[PDB]
Amino acid sequence: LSKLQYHMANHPNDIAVVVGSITDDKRLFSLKQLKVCALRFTETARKRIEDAGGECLTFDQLALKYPTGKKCVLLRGPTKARTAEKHFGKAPGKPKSKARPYVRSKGRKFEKARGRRKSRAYKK
Amino acid sequence: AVKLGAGYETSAESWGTGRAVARIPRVPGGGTHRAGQGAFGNMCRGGGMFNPTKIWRRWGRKVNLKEKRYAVCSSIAASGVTSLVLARGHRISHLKEVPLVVSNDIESLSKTKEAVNFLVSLGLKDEVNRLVKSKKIRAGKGKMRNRKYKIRNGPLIIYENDNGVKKAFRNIPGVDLCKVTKLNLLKLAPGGSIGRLCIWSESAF
Amino acid sequence: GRKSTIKPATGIAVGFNSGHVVTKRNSKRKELIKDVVREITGFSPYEKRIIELIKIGTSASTKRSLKYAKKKLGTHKRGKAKREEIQKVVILQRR
Amino acid sequence: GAYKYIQEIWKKKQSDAMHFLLRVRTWEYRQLPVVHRVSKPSRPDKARRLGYKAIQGFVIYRVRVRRGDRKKRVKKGIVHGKPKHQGVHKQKSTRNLKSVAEGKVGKSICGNLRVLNSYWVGQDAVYKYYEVILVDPNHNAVRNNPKINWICNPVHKHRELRGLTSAGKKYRGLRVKGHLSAKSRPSIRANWKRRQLIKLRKCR
Amino acid sequence: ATRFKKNRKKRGHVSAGHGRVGKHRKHPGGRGKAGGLHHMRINFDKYHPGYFGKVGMRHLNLLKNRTYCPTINVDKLWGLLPEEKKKEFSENKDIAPVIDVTRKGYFKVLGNGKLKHNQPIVVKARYFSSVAEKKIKAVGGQCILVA
Amino acid sequence: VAHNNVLPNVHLHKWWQRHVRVNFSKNIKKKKRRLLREKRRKANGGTPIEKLHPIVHCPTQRYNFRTRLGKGFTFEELKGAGLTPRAAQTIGICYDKRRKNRSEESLTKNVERLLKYKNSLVMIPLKKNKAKKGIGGIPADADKNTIKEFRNKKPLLSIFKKEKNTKPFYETIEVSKIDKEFLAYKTLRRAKLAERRKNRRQQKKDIKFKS
RNA sequence: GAUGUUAGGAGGGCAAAUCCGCCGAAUUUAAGCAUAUAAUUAAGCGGAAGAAAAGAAAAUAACUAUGAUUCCUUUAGUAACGGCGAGUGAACAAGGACCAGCUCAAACGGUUAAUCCUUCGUUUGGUGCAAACCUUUCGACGGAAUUGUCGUU
RNA sequence: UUUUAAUUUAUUCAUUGGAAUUUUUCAUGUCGAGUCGUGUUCUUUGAGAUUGGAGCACUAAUACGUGUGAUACAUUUCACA
RNA sequence: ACGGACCAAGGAGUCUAGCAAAUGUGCAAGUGUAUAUGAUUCUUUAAACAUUUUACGCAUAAUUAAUG
RNA sequence: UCAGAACAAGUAGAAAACGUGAAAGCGUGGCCUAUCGAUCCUUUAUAUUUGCAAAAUGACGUAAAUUACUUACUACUGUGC
Ligand SMILES: [Mg+2]
Ligand SMILES: [Mg+2]
Ligand SMILES: [Mg+2]
Ligand SMILES: [Mg+2]
Ligand SMILES: [Mg+2]
Ligand SMILES: [Mg+2]
Ligand SMILES: [Mg+2]
Ligand SMILES: [Mg+2]
Ligand SMILES: [Mg+2]
Ligand SMILES: [Mg+2]
Ligand SMILES: [Mg+2]
Ligand SMILES: [Mg+2]
Ligand SMILES: [Mg+2]
Ligand SMILES: [Mg+2]
Ligand SMILES: [Mg+2]
Ligand SMILES: [Mg+2]
Ligand SMILES: [Mg+2]
Ligand SMILES: [Mg+2]
Ligand SMILES: [Mg+2]
Ligand SMILES: [Mg+2]
Ligand SMILES: [Mg+2]
Ligand SMILES: [Mg+2]
Ligand SMILES: [Mg+2]
């Protein structure tokens, strides 16, 4: 919701459309009068929107209203913010890679010695 | 599950190479036909089956409570919708309203005959007839395992309290009974097919 | 880690008497027997040796005695205790 | 008071008087047969402190056990496996000599009786001598008396052979409660089994 | 289910998908973690950098309880109140909420994010981070150590 | 091992197949248990299977705040209630020889609970009719009609379950009542710093006391 | 102390899935192997019961503290161990099932062992068609026991 | 048929004996030794200057004691047993 | 080069554990009702239903050998 | 070299502090291309960094205070590991 709000900030009244789910944000305090199309609203988010005196539109409704998407704004949520994606890219082992190793757990006992500190052979 | 050491109860060992016989483990000794025979191993008569079935196969599946609830709701909705019900196979062409609701007098019915009569009056005569017809002896080996008859699935009577419905509709072929509180998706959507014909008491509704 | 029984606990998670608010709520025969035993049995050889060492009188001697006790009994506490007992006995004898 | 006094006397053990007694007694025992009945406890107080009572069915048996380790049983000294397991000669048994003592009396010699307990009595370098307190569970004097009666039950056949006597409890490590003994409690083997156990869940 | 397993798709293909020359043998590379540090060193290096060797102090009896401290960021603190109550608080600058953060199952208050300006908030918790405390104060609130 | 996967950690190098228990018995076992408990209840005509337990605070810094049923009531609490241990045992209440009271408040709470329980409970006579007063703790035996009435009413099992949380967590405070000068982090860190030395002094104090 | 075909009794063998003691490998894994691993497993020997074992704190905590054992969910593949390699790996707390506590020894009672048992009996009952059982308290004649039975806690 | 709940009827008279709390005096008792423990060996453990066990040697203290508080030690608190 | 005299039937990537990726599905700063309880649940029912008139997991914060 | 991992050997710098030169500069060894070594363990250096798991050990240090389980405040706090 916060992200949605941020995106709507400059152009008001026009209708944010989001092809996925919109989740609510406890970290928001105030909610503006938002008009949002989405595939799914988590219930609390929906409630919040309602309270704001906003509108939750489904895709069919949007189509009915704005079939050429006039005064719409496509938005995406954070795609590569997924935890799976943090294991991708250059493998941890290759230098300057910020890829999480697949490890049982965290703590000194797990993947924090040889090849992770200059003191034990090398680093990264 | 197959019993643990099935096919492996023998002492068999392979004779090895220089006898002009494949090197499958052989039963030792003499006198019997069994002597010298291929012993354990999936290929052999009297062998163990390949990956013998074990009790620790995953039998059940956890399904998310929420998902289950959703499924139940959807089945209820389906039962609502006439077309869906029709598709599901019921002879419902002579029933007016398909969220089919009936007075609480039904919950007190004492006699299967009476229930049958009521059903007929409703319009489900045809359905009843179909149900009667469609008790047939299964194809295959089900026959040997207490699955002798195969019966088509009739209406589902949903009731708030049993003052007789349980017992009266018990014994009409294919007719099932469920308390509104404890709705079973297995009954609402047999074979995972949406839109069973549900007959509700008004209290239940 | 440590606390005090007097005073309530400072309403803090960590540090000295840290914790919650809550108001706190809180022979002769033997001797005779021992004497009898002594009369009967006397001492055991190690004990005797220790006594002798003690009698010798000096700090070095005492140290030696202590060491001996440690060797025999095992553990410094027990040995110390034994030494103390022997000293007491010696004192008694002297009276 | 008397028993207190004798307790105190026996605590001394290396003191002259006690020492002499021990010397005599162990010498005497060296001569008698390995397991043999005695009429009265040699350490009445100690017997009392265990389970002993002067009821008809209670008997004391003096038993002698060889001291020391038991050579690993193998035809000739040689063991055929990996070096870790190769040694004989410094192989110390899981059971106590006391346990062994009680075992030998309890098992074939007094199969009729039930071993209650056992106490130390004496030792030489060759042998340790224990007196083991046993009870006849069929003697009515024992059957009737509600305290003690318990031993008449069939669950207590050959307590000594299952490590259920005090000595048994010791070497099973049930004497030590706590974090020191977490791994052995319902029984070591049982505990192990439990820890191994894979619980699946039909639903899963 | 078996019917949509790949092996069923390879049914009549001779090698069952495991290749004709390089066969399918049982445990060709060694068993389990096996030659990590010898013939499987490279894999370990490239996917499991810090795997070999030990580091740091032993901690012979841990007791994860002693050291348990679920955290929350100040940003999330106002979220811990219901919508209507929050609105009420916003309306009345004259009165502030105390928040027993322990009652909601968090011990430490950390300081990630903004707090609504001027809206003063009283925070009860066991631990505060300097920054979180500063944030709270700047907003005219108090941090009250609880236990 | 191959590719980028977790390093495998599967403890199955022993003869694991020997001890796999699959719980086909779960629901049926539960049902059986239920049946057994019902039977027990029936046997104890009217009286409750369940025994009174004191609420207690869980140990360790992390469960500190939570409260749950302990075993057994502590001699002191019994005394407060006006009750003998044996007597308590005989009724529906658990006794715990080894539990001790540090907190007055806690003790008070449990004696309150005990009192409540006492108030609730009505005692069937031992030999019929003959109504006599109890021993040490136990209340009096009621007459027949009263007993009948009680039976006719529902047997309450609210006391045997723990009292749920009081709640708060949101409480209004007046802005003028806030103390804007109280460095909480500073207090913490300072406290941490000063711990050892306070420890040094406490020990000294203790030593002094010991003479 | 021996001795008895003395009077009365007991043990022995079978069976084992779970169970309790010992005793005790190696294949195997480590791409070799020697410590490790397999495994406190298999085999061996002994011993019980409808369950066994455990069990009423020389316990855990460091809290606002809990409170016998067992078992389940978890803690946790964690602390830790380990040619720190392969691999092994608990405990407390938390949530439940179930919940039960106790008696010897020691202290005390000598204006008296009050205890206990064997044999022989005696005479009210209860169910049974009988067979048997069930209990009822009363003595004797024996012994046992002051190197300690019983009561009191 | 099995038992085990509820319900129904107990009322008179005898006295030996015991129990709980409650006052008030006086008693500060007793609390398991070749055992614990240490050393050393071997085993077992996740237990790490040794987790349990065992063999051997040495061998204690009395409740103000001794035993736990997962790093060997000393000096000493404290908590728990 | 090897295997195949012929024919019939049997005859070989499976099942569990835990991890990952992919994709579907639910809900989403949460999620999973775990054991267990409860029900007017009892051929099917060993499922289904329910969750007491701040359990735990994984995630929501990282980092340090560590006090932190 | 190459997986564009490591080690090793270099190239280019930066922050210190110096050397040399009058200076500009040059110097992070040998005019350049070889002369060499992971984990674990050991070892000795370094440090206003920590720990040994209920606590303490510099130190009742410095102030107060009264005899006591007093109140503040201190970067420097045992051996061993
Ligand atoms: Mg077969
Ligand atoms: Mg067919
Ligand atoms: Mg051995
Ligand atoms: Mg192909
Ligand atoms: Mg091939
Ligand atoms: Mg090839
Ligand atoms: Mg036998
Ligand atoms: Mg190998
Ligand atoms: Mg190999
Ligand atoms: Mg080999
Ligand atoms: Mg076996
Ligand atoms: Mg038992
Ligand atoms: Mg467990
Ligand atoms: Mg985990
Ligand atoms: Mg192991
Ligand atoms: Mg004691
Ligand atoms: Mg081992
Ligand atoms: Mg601890
Ligand atoms: Mg050829
Ligand atoms: Mg060939
Ligand atoms: Mg051929
Ligand atoms: Mg052929
Ligand atoms: Mg997925």
Planar angle of CA F200, F201, F205, nearest 5 degrees: 125
The bridge status of strand E71-73 relative to strand E108-110 is parallel
Closest CA to F50 of F140, F156, F134: F156
Q: Do E133 and F184 touch (CB under 8 A)?
A: yes
Q: How far is the CA of F58 from the C1' of G92 (A)?
A: 13
Q: How far apart are CA E8 and CA E17, in angstroms?
A: 11
Helix, strand or coil, per DSSP, at residue D38: strand
- E48 contact partners, CB below 8 Å, separation of at least 6: A92, A93, A101, A103, A111, E36, F7
Quickly give F129 CA vs H9 C1' distance in Å: 10
Give the distance (Å) from ligand 18 centre to CA of residue F101: 21
Distance F199 CA to I45 C1' (A): 65
Token representation of residue A103: 């490890």
Name the CA dihedral angle for D155, D161, D165, D166, rounded to a multiple of 10 degrees: -150
User: Do E109 and E77 touch, CB atoms closer than 8 A?
Assistant: yes
Annotated binding site of D: 80
Resolution reading in Å:
3.2
3-state secondary structure of C4: coil
Contact list in F for residue A103 (CB cut-off 8 A) is: 6-7
Q: How far apart are the first and last CA of chain A?
A: 38
> E16 C-alpha vs ligand 19 centroid, how far in Å?
29
What Å distances lie between residue E45 and A113, B183, D144, CA to CA? 12, 56, 76
CA B42 to ligand 9 center in whole angstroms: 26
CB contact under 8 A, C42 and D16: yes
Contact present, D82 and D60 (Cβ < 8 Å): no
Q: Sort out which chain A residues have CB atoms less than 8 A from E90's CB and list them.
A: 29-30
Scanning every strand, the nucleotide with its C1' closest to A91's CA turns out to be J5
| Exp. method | cryo-EM
CB distance D167 to D102 below 8 Å: yes
Contact B62 D203 (CB under 8 A): yes
- In window 21-80 of F, residues with CB < 7 A from nucleic chain I are 24, 26-31, 33-34, 37, 62-63, 65-66
What is the rounded CA–CA span in Å between residue C16 and residue F198? 6
Residues 6+ apart with CB under 8 A from B142: B148, B150
Kindly determine whether residue F5 and residue A91, on different chains, have CB atoms separated by under 8 Å.
no
Confirm or reject contact between F62 and chain D (CB < 8 A).
no
DSSP, res B23 = -
CB of C3 within 8 A of CB of C20? no
Q: Does D180 contact F at CB distance below 8 Å?
A: no
The whole-angstrom separation of Cα E93 and Cα B154 is: 65
Q: Which nucleotides on strand I sit less than 7 A from a protein beta carbon? A: 9-22, 25-43, 45-50, 52-56, 59-68
DSSP B119-146: HIIIIIHHHHHHHHHT-EEPSGGGGGGT
Report the amino acid identity of residue B94. Answer: H
Cβ of E83 within 8 Å of Cβ of A47? The answer is yes
Tokens of E66: 């002693």
| CA C73 to ligand 18 centroid distance, Å | 28
Interaxial angle between packed helices C76-94 and C59-73, expressed in degrees from 0 to 180 and rounded to the nearest 10: 130
Phi, psi for E140 (deg, rounded to 5) = 85, 20
Residue C12 and residue F187: Cβ atoms within 8 Å?
Answer: yes
For B203, phi and psi rounded to 5 degrees?
Answer: -60, -45
State whether the Cα torsion E41-E44-E49-E55 is positive or negative.
negative
Ion ligand 2, residues whose Cβ is below 5 A away: B 140
Q: For residues F172 and A3, what is the distance between their CA atoms, to the nearest angstrom? A: 31
Q: Nearest CA to the C1' of H34 belongs to which residue?
A: D120
Q: How far is CA F71 from CA A29, A114, F51, F53, F81, in A?
A: 46, 51, 9, 6, 17
State both tokens at B98.
């398909």
